[PDB]
Symmetry: D2
Subunit: 436 residues, 4 copies
């Protein structure tokens, strides 16, 4: 009680009853479970991104607008099916639906476009079809590649080479789908931007009763590395034909978030099912409940104990900002970023505070959806003559969007993360600001 | 040997943090210990045949659930007879005989305020037919449990009452319900209709945590392997759900339509068995034991004091088993509440206690049938030897293993007070 | 490695003790301040210069002995010795002046009222108030200091059973506490003093307020050039307990080896500070420190967390009153807290907080406030390089505010030296 | 119930704390120690403490081990001091409530190899039946082997406590501890051989490693130095004694304080008073957790039984753990887990009864009844002897819970049973 008494008097007992805060203050994991409360409502914005596979059931512009409003952050295009012409039309429809909300950043929502490859088949390396599909991705400006059946580090180097010099900025998320991928996980993660636990093939390649071990291990190692991890396949499977999921399906979604997944995915549920929008809404509702139930006290302590010492100022500032946000129950951490890296380094410490990432790069704004708890804001104004004023305008842009979009209210504390000079790699400042 | 320390997720068990424990989980680290989470299979048209029941017992069914929401008393009495016939077909080999509990799951109160007249009749049927457990539907408060207990009468005092929590009131009045119940069932079917579907996992994890803290059995139920009612293999979400119920701390996992009416009853039991064994090896015992110890209050009860000493001793030597003599199952339950990795082999002469201890995780009941020796110390030794011989035959024990033996200072229940370190010869 | 770093990485306190190494040399500057009692043996300007060089941070004047004329001459000699090093601003060491009252004897005595008035007139920085037994005793001392002594720190001396029992109410209204073991060891059983000491140090560490361990720490050094094994152990254990300051009484006031006693406390404190198990200490201080909406409070925890992440050589903080440095000190960083201040009094008083190294800023003011802040930060860096705290390539954490004036600290910056 | 008053004594509010910092904050000067003093006191016998009458007062004050410093005196002088110790000890054999075994320890003069004088003094120790040797200036494992060889054919049961007095002993500590029965942190010479300001690091490290190895460790020299001439110690001296106990020392020592000082009895009384206070202030929650986590897994039934018995004693706040031991080993393995319950060791070996004083919290009871023909009856008689002695001495009352540790067959090395008994 003494460690929360003054803040309880100031913020109120009602504030400390919401978002599983009594369970968050527990001294043991067992006590944390015992304090979980179905009446404790989630307040924070949903931080785990939803990837929706785009197909016949979710192709139209009108349907895609509903999916964006329901919570879709990443549109996946499965190159195992369809054609280049079919997928290009789906991509154009996604972009049309996304841009229909570009009226003001107080209502704008960026959406990443991901290409999921067919894979190597019986062959041992990049398939000729994968080379053509990866070239298509670069030509159509995809943000992410979900590379199928990655079995070793040279597989991701081959994917990187097929993207050429013009696809240098595309994120490569390696899909682990077999025994070799699990066994060579460390070398694959080292050269990848992130990982997808592709449970469909994994559950056929290894005993079905061992998939949960591979999932928890890969999520834990990705959390330790500070790299995005996606949990995929059959999460809400029954929703392909039914309007409501099973008890095992809601449990699976909640447990993927509690495991530490940055993203959760919908495959047949959105590509061909009868309830694509309802499936997105269900993942959204479960993820908000599960994020509040995360035991941050042990998680943050373990992420600190395991993360090595760092002499990188972006990394040092990120841990200081997350520590400061927990100390004051900050509503948000506003960070200026060019490539998304400063937001990713904040996200790896799993703050409860939303990470509002203000960027001029449309691609970085789409790609940061891979990192849990990062809310991208695309800044469109031309640069101010004085760099310090251009920085301040970008911070104010995040404070006004947050104030008028629920995130922030007058009296809230926010942590602001900036650098000392223009350009990528110079984040080194953390500021505590009171919202007026 | 090095091979021993590579199996049963032992590298992940030695980790200094939960995060490093997850990072060390290995799909090639094979489970060695016997499956400790009990499987409850609901009886119906797909599982009533005496020959089909024999296959389900071999696959791992520990408790047979009779769902009184369907069928007459004549139907349930035939189910009881078929279950008992299949169980007793293995009684000719006492070292391998597996007791199977019979649980009666009530229809419930309906639009009524408390115990239905149908439940009063069904509960009296349960006592008359010797059921071991009652899964009481829609328990909303402590007086619902007292009413179930009263309907069982003086002849049903030994029947275990597991309260099913199926609505908001049951979740909110959980503490008072657990206090008077023998255990709890997280009845997710109705719970997921009574409260928002996205909140069920919070109610499940909370109730399992509180039951683990109280040392009382908790069952995770409904739609765990739902797709297996019509498909031979479950979905990725279903295997995950079963593994996570075990990781949460559930003593039992349940099958409903998967065994009552589906096309794969035996395979659904085999699937729960396979998943539970993998998930039990992945339990982070270092944190779990530490937290259970820290939260368990001080006690002046010798059974409770001996149990924590025996669990601490078992962890110190990597004991293959804790062999406990028990009359009511209580000494085995008090060992089980500390979640030892060592199997708790409970030797009992009570056929009912042998069936009921399946509610406690990691308790393997052995029904001892020999008449008592004239010298009490010799009768205790013969039972301990029966435990060792059954354990060797079933694969729990080998020569050279260390075992912890928990016994008492005089006959009758309530006098457990001794813990002994024994080398298997 | 140096500064007990293998013992610092240990996963348990037991393994930390097992890894302590007599060959692991201390590198960090000595964090625990030394209070030396000034008397016949340590009065001369030449002797005081050697005591400052040996490590004396606070000069204590015991008003139980001497006279106003005697103590005023001791104060003038301390100031003369301190100011003899002012010609080199990058290495100048401020020294606080503390007045220790005679006490109530058999409420606030008339002699204490006169002595407290003397302290205000002579510009003392701290009052060590004798025999504090309740909150109203502190209020009486505060009232006797009047309107001109509002800035003087009151450190309540706990010397009897009532002071121990009413500790919480005394700490609440005091700036800090002194565990006055001489009288405490007569007032309560001698074998219970260590319990009162460890409890008071723990509660002061929890409150983020300075605590002094005092009396008979190196007693045998009054006549002998080397202390006993129990005395070196006592000094090391007071530092390991969490004391912000350690004190010398007869050892410096009347003994034959005043300079050697200061040197011995300095040598032991440096060794003991490196042996502190920061992994458990920081985690416990962090877990127990309440949630806060005060930006100075929030910035301090962020800065200490950042310093541990990069093994920062120092945390450079700008402070008017010393408060921003005190809030960093309460988390016990391994990094030195270099406090750059224009207030000569705050520079002297900040010696009460463990690990705070005060730098008195005497350079011309900049016209642009941002440029003025930058030059005070570069002054912290140049003084740090000269004193051995910093080297080129080191990382430092810089803590500053958004606007001039006290109470506005809200910024933490990661800076690479040179 | 035990009552709220029970939970206010022996620093029990500080014992329940969830952090070490909270534990310190909850220490209470009004919380009185109830348990018997568990840290043995070693007193150096010299001119000021040699007489039978003075030795009787020192035994009553709390002396458990009599140290004879072979750096001074002679064989004749030390033999007379030993005879006086034995006469003073045996003067209490007519009262079970007052009788207490007292170990006799020989501290060598010290050293190329073992000195000629040390060979003769070690032979004197064997001939006079000493229990312990405090071996001066041990620098390496071969120094311990030389002392062991010198203990001739009749003295292999004598305990060798290696004194660490210089840089080489500190640096070769692990190899020395491996072959020694225990260690003495000999701070006098250590504070001359290494910088004085580093002695506390060597002390804390050696105590921690001995606690980890489950071997006795003695903190020695200048603990109450001023009491050689003054009736009361300094604030630094009481602090030093309390901190040696909090560090984890099994024994604390008095040298000039008892050998030649003006207040030998008062110095013993002061160490007794401080140790009792400091033992109650030990943070058992973290200590037991860390001893468990660091101690490797074991297939030795005595070690497995010991941890189970200590866990059981903490669970019920057992007044005592009664253990049957012939060599002292079963009591030593209980002691290494630092139970708050007193370890009452029932033995037929007079030497083991004296030597177990080296292990913190072991209260030896020498049993001299003739053996019963039925072994189970002889075991029950010794268990009841421990219970009746415990009731007589104030350790136990009817209604208390005790833990009893025995083995399954006679002879040393078979401990494998732990029982929970209600005192009737
Ligand atoms: O791009 C698609 C697509 C493209 C063009 C026509 C139909 C589809 C389609 O039905 C579809 C279904 C799915 S799907 O429903 O997720 N699923 C169908 C069965 C096979 C699964 C597999 O790849 O193993 C996939 C998609 O992932 C993608 C598409
Ligand atoms: O101010 C002092 C002083 C002032 C003028 C003459 C002599 C002295 C002196 O000897 C002295 C000794 C000491 S002292 O050595 O610490 N000590 C002497 C004995 C009584 C102790 C007590 O107060 O209980 C104090 C001082 O603390 C201060 C002075
Ligand atoms: O056995 C003793 C003894 C035996 C015969 C005559 C005198 C003494 C004596 O004074 C004495 C003093 C001490 S002592 O007081 O501990 N001693 C003081 C001076 C020498 C020191 C040293 O050895 O470094 C320690 C003893 O340890 C032992 C004896
Ligand atoms: O997260 P990234 O990719 O390193 O970008 C962070 C960068 O953004 C800034 O805050 C502002 O940079 P710009 O003015 O170039 O947009 C820099 O100071 C910092 O280096
Ligand atoms: O677990 P419970 O029901 O308390 O049974 C434990 C009892 O079993 C025993 O070990 C054996 O007793 P019985 O010979 O009566 O079967 C008793 O000593 C002990 O009291
Ligand atoms: O520690 P204090 O007393 O609050 O002083 C800290 C203050 O110092 C500063 O860094 C610099 O202030 P000045 O320019 O007034 O000296 C402020 O921004 C900040 O509020
Ligand atoms: O501690 P030690 O020397 O191993 O002695 C323990 C032995 O004492 C006993 O409890 C009793 O043995 P004895 O009857 O021979 O004295 C044995 O069962 C056990 O092995
Ligand atoms: O490839 C996939 O996405 C899978 O198998 O889940
Ligand atoms: O009754 C049940 O088992 C349920 O609702 O899940
Ligand atoms: O006044 C003091 O310093 C004391 O009593 O210790
Ligand atoms: O020999 C000793 O005891 C010493 O040197 O401390
Ligand atoms: K694909
Ligand atoms: K039912
Ligand atoms: K005074
Ligand atoms: K000697
Ligand atoms: Mg696949
Ligand atoms: Mg139901
Ligand atoms: Mg005083
Ligand atoms: Mg010596």
């Amino acid at each position: 009680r003494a460690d929360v008494a003054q803040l309880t008097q100031e913020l109120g007992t009602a504030f400390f009853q919401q978002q599983q805060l009594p369970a968050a203050m527990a001294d043991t994991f067992l006590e944390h479970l015992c304090l979980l409360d179905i009446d404790s409502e989630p307040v924070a914005a949903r931080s785990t991104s939803i990837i929706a596979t785009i197909g016949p059931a979710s192709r139209s512009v009108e349907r895609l607008k509903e999916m964006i409003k329901a919570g879709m952050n990443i549109a996946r295009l499965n190159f195992s099916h369809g054609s280049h012409e079919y997928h290009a039309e789906s991509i154009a429809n996604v972009r049309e639906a996304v841009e229909s909300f570009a009226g003001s950043p107080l209502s704008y929502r960026p959406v990443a476009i991901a290409l999921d490859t067919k894979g190597p088949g019986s062959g041992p390396g990049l398939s000729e079809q994968d080379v053509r599909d990866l070239r298509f991705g670069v030509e159509h400006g995809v943000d992410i590649v979900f590379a199928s059946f990655v079995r070793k580090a040279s597989d991701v180097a081959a994917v990187r080479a097929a993207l050429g010099p013009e696809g240098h900025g595309i994120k490569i998320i390696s899909k682990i789908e077999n025994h070799e991928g699990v066994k060579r996980f460390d070398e694959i993660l080292e050269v990848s931007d992130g990982i997808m636990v592709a449970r469909g093939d994994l559950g056929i390649e290894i005993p079905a009763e061992k998939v949960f071990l591979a999932q928890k291990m890969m999520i834990g190692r990705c959390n330790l590395a500070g790299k995005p991890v996606v949990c995929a396949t059959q999460m809400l499977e029954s929703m392909i034909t039914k309007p409501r999921p099973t008890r095992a399906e809601t449990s699976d979604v909640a447990n993927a978030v509690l495991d530490g997944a940055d993203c959760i995915m919908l495959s047949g549920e959105t590509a061909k099912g009868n309830f694509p929008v309802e499936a997105v809404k269900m993942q959204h509702a479960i993820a908000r409940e599960a994020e509040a139930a995360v035991y941050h006290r042990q998680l943050f302590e373990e992420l600190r104990r395991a993360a090595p010492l760092s002499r990188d100022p972006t990394e040092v500032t990120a841990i200081g900002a997350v520590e400061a946000a927990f100390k004051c129950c900050a509503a948000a951490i506003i960070v200026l970023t060019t490539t998304g890296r400063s937001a990713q380094l904040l996200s790896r410490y799993r703050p409860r505070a939303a990470v509002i990432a203000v960027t001029r790069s449309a691609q970085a704004a789409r790609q940061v959806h891979l990192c849990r708890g990062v809310f991208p804001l695309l800044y469109r104004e031309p640069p101010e003559a004085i760099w310090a004023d251009d920085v301040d305008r970008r911070v104010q842009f995040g404070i006004e969007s947050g104030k008028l979009r629920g995130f922030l209210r007058v009296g809230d504390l926010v942590i602001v993360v900036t650098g000392w000079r223009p350009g990528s790699g110079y984040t080194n400042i953390m500021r505590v600001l009171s919202i007026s």
